[PDB]
C-alpha cells in the first residue's frame, strides 16, 4: 500500500521553468520547443514491489519499472542513458539520474488532488503539476 496515492492516470496541467530546467540539463532547442509543447498523460501502477511510471505523449512514450531503492538504467525521453535510484522519503517519490558526472533530481508527491512534480538541475527547478485524467 506504499504509493497507494501516487497510483492512477494523471493528465499534466500547468508548468512552470521547465525550458530553462531542459536547457540546464543540456537538452538541445529542437527536443526542448517540441518536448515543452507535450500534454503527458503519467499511468503509475503497483505489483507487489515493482513500481511501473508510463508517460504517454505526443512527443514520446516511455516507461520504467523498479524497485524502490535499487538502482536501474533509464533511457530518458530527452534519449539520455542514465542510472535511476528512486526512493521513498517522507512520502514523497525521490527519483536521482546519474549520467555523465552530471545528476537531477525528480521528486514526485500528492499536494490535494494534485501529484506535483519537482525537476531539479543544480539551482534550477521546474514545477509540473498533474491533475486524475
Ligand atoms: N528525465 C528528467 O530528468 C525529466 C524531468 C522532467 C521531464 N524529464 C524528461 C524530459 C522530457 C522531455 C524533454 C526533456 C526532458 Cl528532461
Not at 542510472?83 to 525521490?94: A, F, H, N, Q, W
Not at 521528486?107 to 485524467?133: F, H, I, N, Q, W
Request: charged share 30%.
Amino acid at each position: 500500500h506504499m504509493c497507494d496515492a501516487f497510483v492512477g492516470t494523471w493528465k499534466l496541467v500547468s508548468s512552470e521553468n521547465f525550458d530553462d530546467y531542459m536547457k540546464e540539463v543540456g537538452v538541445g532547442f529542437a527536443t526542448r520547443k517540441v518536448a515543452g509543447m507535450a500534454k503527458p498523460n503519467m499511468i503509475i501502477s503497483v505489483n507487489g514491489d515493482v513500481i511501473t511510471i508510463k508517460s504517454e505523449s505526443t512527443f514520446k512514450n516511455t516507461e520504467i519499472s523498479f524497485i524502490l531503492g535499487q538502482e536501474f538504467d533509464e533511457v530518458t525521453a530527452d534519449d539520455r542513458k542514465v542510472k535511476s535510484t528512486i526512493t521513498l522519503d517522507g512520502g514523497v517519490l525521490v527519483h536521482v539520474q546519474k549520467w555523465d558526472g552530471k545528476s537531477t533530481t525528480i521528486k514526485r508527491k500528492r499536494e490535494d488532488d494534485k501529484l506535483v512534480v519537482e525537476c531539479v538541475m543544480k539551482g534550477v527547478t521546474s514545477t509540473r503539476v498533474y491533475e486524475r485524467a
